[PDB]
Structure 1
Amino acid sequence: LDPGLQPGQFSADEAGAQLFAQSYQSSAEQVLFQSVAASWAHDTNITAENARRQEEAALLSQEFAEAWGQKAKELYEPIWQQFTDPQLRRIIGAVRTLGSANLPLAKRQQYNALLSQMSRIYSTAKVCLTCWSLDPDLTNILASSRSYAMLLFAWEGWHNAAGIPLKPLYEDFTALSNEAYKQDGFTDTGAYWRSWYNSPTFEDDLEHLYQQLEPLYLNLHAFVRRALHRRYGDRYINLRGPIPAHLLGDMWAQSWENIYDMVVPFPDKPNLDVTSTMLQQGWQATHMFRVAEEFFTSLELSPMPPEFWEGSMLEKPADGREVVCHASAWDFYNRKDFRIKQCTRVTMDQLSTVHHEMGHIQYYLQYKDLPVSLRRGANPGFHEAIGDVLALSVSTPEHLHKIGLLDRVTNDTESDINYLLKMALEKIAFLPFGYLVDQWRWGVFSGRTPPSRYNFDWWYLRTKYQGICPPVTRNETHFDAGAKFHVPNVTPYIRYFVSFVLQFQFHEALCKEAGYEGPLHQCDIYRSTKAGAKLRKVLRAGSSRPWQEVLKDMVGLDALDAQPLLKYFQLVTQWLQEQNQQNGEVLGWPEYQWHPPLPDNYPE
């Protein structure tokens, strides 16, 4: 570690800790920068030289975290928890967590190589027949092929190309992760991730939430299954069984918006898939990011700075570079550079993604004057919900009309149901998956799920929550969890399930704040500076206050709550139950063992 980046000595008291924290922040910004830059260079231009550079930068981070973490312990272990400055408690608390820096050198190099190589496998896997990439080629197939056999080729190809080679690396990764966090005092890496919510009842609270939401997911499931049955027939849909995992518009069956055309109940109302309008009108990526930006500035939030437009990668390069396509928002920790990396496609759901990713940028912008340690969401769930809150306003028919993507606007119940159904395909269908992914990973980290049951336990969770089955047999050579980006990327997932509930809480608060008197699902906070002021206060707090306190200031409750989500969807909940009863459906999948046959001359 460079001389200038090493800690000195401070007094062993709170006064000295302030100075410690100041000097830490200078050094950290410089180290975070060099690291975020090296990853950027990699993720936008995947080569061996850039990977070796990222690994060297991660190593420098680890030396840093170690020298400053050791020093925080040496000076402040007795006293940091009694400090008067709440923000300084959190900072020192962060600084003393070594994570992977607890590893000895050879194991840090191994850990870093594993992250690098899993990233590269996930992001450069192709399916050949001439080779298709996940984005855009396989995404597109899943979204709008309706050939059972072609969807299967893509689903299986993908899960095979990405899963199988990840498994040896994922096992090694898990061992090293656990080893590292055990020396911070955690029983496993999972306990560490769960500790961010700083809630003794965390697992219980989530299950109380999921139990309240499960009826909606079940009603929707049964409805969609019936729709699928009408198209794909009795051979490939069991009305009493899980849905084949490849028929729902998305590689992970995590969002079902792309099958909207098979379920929409009132096809004579305004068509709420504006994708073809966007294509007809000649939208490009730039436009999408501009329209998101303008939403933000209508709230008196900050615009994207020059550095964002000059630095971002908002399109897949055509120059034959390998990139990580999976959309992400980047803070370089220099208070100046913020960028999005996205292989933006021109569709309505990518319009949401854009807003999602811009939510992150906006958070980065508001809290950039906090100490580096506090430059994060009140919890990771907060960070994920910001863009999604705006996107709820954007998707409303009124707002789509105002940005010229919907030629007229109805305000009738048939339209409301169309709308709420679409939103349910996006939001309610995701709920089981948001919950299940980290359940799988907590199991793996704790040792409940060894390598020999990685795929067994994954599909148990898939069937249990989502009510889907693999469309071909899987076994333990397969590693289907690893064909989902967040797993090889080591990005926690429970934040999304938290986000998907929190976003309706935020929505309801901002709408009330904006003066909006009508049904929640027709609220548009566009141009509400009051709503903006309320959101800004949250963004600016970063992680400097307990999320339960920030939440209470914002929505009046100190806890995640399903009521807003439920009142948002209330009308389509009542509608779906009526339909499912009149069609004599079975809620759930009592024929849990059922799997569909192979197509006749498959794999051809």
Structure 2
Amino acid sequence: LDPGLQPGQFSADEAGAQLFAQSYQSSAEQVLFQSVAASWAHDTNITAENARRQEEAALLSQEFAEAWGQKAKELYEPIWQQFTDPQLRRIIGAVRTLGSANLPLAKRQQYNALLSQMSRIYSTAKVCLTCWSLDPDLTNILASSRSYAMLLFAWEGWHNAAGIPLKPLYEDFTALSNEAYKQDGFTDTGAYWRSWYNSPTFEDDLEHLYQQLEPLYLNLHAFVRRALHRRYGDRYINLRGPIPAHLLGDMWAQSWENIYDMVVPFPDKPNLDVTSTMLQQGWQATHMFRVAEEFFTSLELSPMPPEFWEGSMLEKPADGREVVCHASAWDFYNRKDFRIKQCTRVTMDQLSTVHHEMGHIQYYLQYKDLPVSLRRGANPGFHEAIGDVLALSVSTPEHLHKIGLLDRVTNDTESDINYLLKMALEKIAFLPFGYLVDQWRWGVFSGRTPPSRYNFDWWYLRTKYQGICPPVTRNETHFDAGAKFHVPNVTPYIRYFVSFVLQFQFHEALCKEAGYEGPLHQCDIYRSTKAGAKLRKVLRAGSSRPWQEVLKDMVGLDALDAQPLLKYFQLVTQWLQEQNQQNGEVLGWPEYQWHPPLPDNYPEGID
């Protein structure tokens, strides 16, 4: 570790710490920066050499964390936690969690190499027939094809190609991760990840929220299953069984907006999927990013700085470089460099993703002058909610009209149902998936789910919560959880469930602050400087204060609350319940064993 980066001397008392954190920060920014830069160089250009460089940067960060962390415990382990400065004990608390720096050097190196190899396997996996990538090729197939066999080829191909080789690496990763966090006093890595929400009742609170939301999902599920039955027929859809997992528009069946055209209740009203209009008008990634930016500046939040435009990767490279296409936002911790890395495609759903990613960047811009340990969301769910809240305004028919994407204007009950159904496909359909992923992973970290049951427990959860089934037989050689980005890329998931509840709480509060008095689902906060100021207060806080307090200031309640989501969807919630009753549906999937048959001649009968 460079002499300039090593910790010096301090008093073994409460006073010996503010100068400590200032010195830490001076060096931490340099270390964080070099780590983020090496990660960027790999993720935008996957090579063995860039993996090696990223692994060297990771070792340095671990050296740095070990040095600064052993000092805390030398000086303060018996006595720290006690009074004056709130932001200071947060900064200290973060410095003394060693994590992977607890591993001996050989295991640090193994851990870093595992992360690099898992990332490569996921982001370079292909389905061969010249071979198809996940993004754009398989993603486009899942979104647009109505060929059962083609969808199956893409789904099976992807899950086999990505999941199977990940399994042994994921096992080794899990063991090392647990070994690391156990030395910080956590029972397993999952307990560490949950500790970020600073709630002794987190898992119970989540379960109680899910109980309120589940009826909405079950009714959406039953209606969508019927719509699919009318297209695919009785061979491939069981009206009392789980929906085959490849028919819902998305590789993970995690959101269903791409099958909107099959489910739209009133097809004679204006067409709310504006993708075809975006393509007709010649939108490109650049336009999408500038349009999102202009929403942020309408609220008097910050534009994207020049360094963002110069350094970001906004389209998949056309030079045959391998890249991590999965959309992500990047803080370089130098208060200057902030970037998005997205293989942007021209679609409505991608415009929402652009807003999502830009919300992260806006957070980074607003807290860039805080101490580096405080440059985080109030919790990770807050970070995920910011862009989505703006996208809720952008997606309204009235806003789409303002930006030239929806010519017809209508305000009638049928049009409302269409809109709320489209939004339900995006937001309600996600809820079970958002909830189940870290239920799976928490069980893996705890040892409740050993390698012998990775797939059995994954599919238990997928069927339990989503009411889907794999469209081909699976066994434990398959590792279908590994075919979802966040698993091999070690990114926690519960943040997205939290976000999907939180964003409606934020939307309600911002709409009220804006002076809007109509139905919550027709609110557009565009050009509300007052809504902008309220949001800015959240963003500038970082993690300086407990999330419960930040939330209370913003929305008037100190807790996650489903009521604003329920209020937003009330009309369609009622409508779906009535339609399923009238159509004679069974809610749920009592034929829980059911899987669909294979297509004739599969896979040979596909062009």
TM-score by length of 1: 1.00
After TM superposition, list the pairs within 5 Å mapping 1:247-326 onto structure 2: 247-326=247-326
Shift of 1:278: 0.4
Shift of 1:77: 2.0
Shift of 1:269: 1.1
Shift of 1:250: 0.1
Aligned to 2:243: 243
Distance in 2, matches of 1:448 and 1:176, equals 17
Q: Per-residue CA shift, 1:30-85, capped at 9, x if unaligned?
A: 00000000000000011111000000000000000000011112122233211310
Unaligned runs of 5+ in 1: none
Distance in 2, matches of 1:153 and 1:116, equals 28
SS at match of 1:516: coil
Aligned to 2:187: 187
Distance in 2, matches of 1:515 and 1:12, equals 53
- Contact 2:102 / 2:183 at 8 angstroms: preserved in 1? yes
Q: Per-residue CA shift, 1:540-568, capped at 9, x if unaligned?
A: 00001000000000000000000000000
Q: Per-residue CA shift, 1:439-462, capped at 9, x if unaligned?
A: 000000000000000000000000
SS at match of 1:597: coil
Distance in 2, matches of 1:312 and 1:73, equals 40
Q: Per-residue CA shift, 1:165-220, capped at 9, x if unaligned?
A: 00000000000000000000000000000111100110000000000000000000
Q: Per-residue CA shift, 1:462-509, capped at 9, x if unaligned?
A: 000000000000000000000000000000000000000000000000
Distance in 2, matches of 1:308 and 1:603, equals 45
Q: Per-residue CA shift, 1:213-257, capped at 9, x if unaligned?
A: 000000000000000000000010000000000000000000000
Shift of 1:11: 1.3
Shift of 1:520: 0.3
Distance in 2, matches of 1:286 and 1:12, equals 54
Distance in 2, matches of 1:12 and 1:519, equals 58
Aligned to 2:114: 114
Shift of 1:15: 2.7
Shift of 1:264: 0.3
Shift of 1:389: 0.2
Give the percent of matched residue pairs that are identical in Structure 1 and Structure 2.
100
Q: Per-residue CA shift, 1:80-131, capped at 9, x if unaligned?
A: 2113101011110000000000000000000000000000000000000110
Distance in 2, matches of 1:464 and 1:322, equals 36
- Contact 2:469 / 2:595 at 8 angstroms: preserved in 1? yes
Q: Per-residue CA shift, 1:243-280, capped at 9, x if unaligned?
A: 00000000000000000000001111111100010000
Aligned to 1:407: 407
Q: Per-residue CA shift, 1:403-461, capped at 9, x if unaligned?
A: 00000211111110000000000000000000000000000000000000000000000
SS at match of 1:340: strand
Unaligned runs of 5+ in 2: none
- Contact 2:98 / 2:184 at 8 angstroms: preserved in 1? yes
SS at match of 1:14: coil
Shift of 1:16: 1.9
Distance in 2, matches of 1:73 and 1:310, equals 42
Shift of 1:394: 0.2
- Contact 2:14 / 2:82 at 8 angstroms: preserved in 1? no
SS at match of 1:486: coil
Using the TM superposition, name which of 548-557 and 8-17 deviates more. Answer: 8-17
- Contact 2:548 / 2:559 at 8 angstroms: preserved in 1? yes
Distance in 1, matches of 2:184 and 2:561, equals 32
Distance in 2, matches of 1:466 and 1:175, equals 29
Distance in 1, matches of 2:505 and 2:12, equals 43
SS at match of 2:304: coil
SS at match of 1:329: strand
Distance in 2, matches of 1:70 and 1:30, equals 20
Using the TM superposition, name which of 450-459 and 264-273 deviates more. Answer: 264-273
Using the TM superposition, name which of 306-315 and 405-414 deviates more. Answer: 405-414
Distance in 2, matches of 1:13 and 1:420, equals 57
Shift of 1:142: 0.1
- Report the aligned-residue RMSD: 0.5
Aligned to 1:493: 493
Shift of 1:353: 0.3
Distance in 1, matches of 2:313 and 2:14, equals 43
Aligned to 2:381: 381
After TM superposition, list the pairs within 5 Å mapping 1:43-192 onto structure 2: 43-192=43-192
Distance in 1, matches of 2:217 and 2:16, equals 53
Distance in 2, matches of 1:92 and 1:72, equals 8
Distance in 1, matches of 2:80 and 2:553, equals 27
SS at match of 2:488: helix
TM-score by length of 2: 0.99
Shift of 1:10: 1.0
Shift of 1:356: 0.3
Aligned to 2:342: 342
SS at match of 2:198: coil
Aligned to 1:575: 575
- Contact 2:127 / 2:154 at 8 angstroms: preserved in 1? yes
Using the TM superposition, name which of 110-119 and 406-415 deviates more. Answer: 406-415
Shift of 1:159: 0.2
Distance in 1, matches of 2:397 and 2:247, equals 27
Shift of 1:13: 2.5
- Contact 2:462 / 2:468 at 8 angstroms: preserved in 1? yes
Distance in 2, matches of 1:89 and 1:60, equals 25
Distance in 1, matches of 2:477 and 2:426, equals 32
Distance in 2, matches of 1:307 and 1:12, equals 42
Distance in 2, matches of 1:46 and 1:107, equals 23
SS at match of 1:518: coil
Count of aligned pairs: 604
Distance in 1, matches of 2:403 and 2:85, equals 47
- Contact 2:355 / 2:391 at 8 angstroms: preserved in 1? yes
SS at match of 1:580: helix
SS at match of 1:330: strand
Using the TM superposition, name which of 74-83 and 96-105 deviates more. Answer: 74-83
Distance in 1, matches of 2:83 and 2:324, equals 43
Distance in 1, matches of 2:438 and 2:23, equals 36
Shift of 1:14: 2.9
- Contact 2:126 / 2:132 at 8 angstroms: preserved in 1? yes
Using the TM superposition, name which of 285-294 and 12-21 deviates more. Answer: 12-21
- Contact 2:385 / 2:503 at 8 angstroms: preserved in 1? yes
SS at match of 1:270: coil
Distance in 1, matches of 2:395 and 2:259, equals 17
Q: Per-residue CA shift, 1:283-322, capped at 9, x if unaligned?
A: 0000000000000011110000000000000000001100
Shift of 1:524: 0.2
Aligned to 1:221: 221
Distance in 2, matches of 1:495 and 1:93, equals 21
Shift of 1:576: 0.2
Runs of 4+ in 1 over 4 A off after TM superposition: none
SS at match of 2:173: helix
Using the TM superposition, name which of 28-37 and 9-18 deviates more. Answer: 9-18
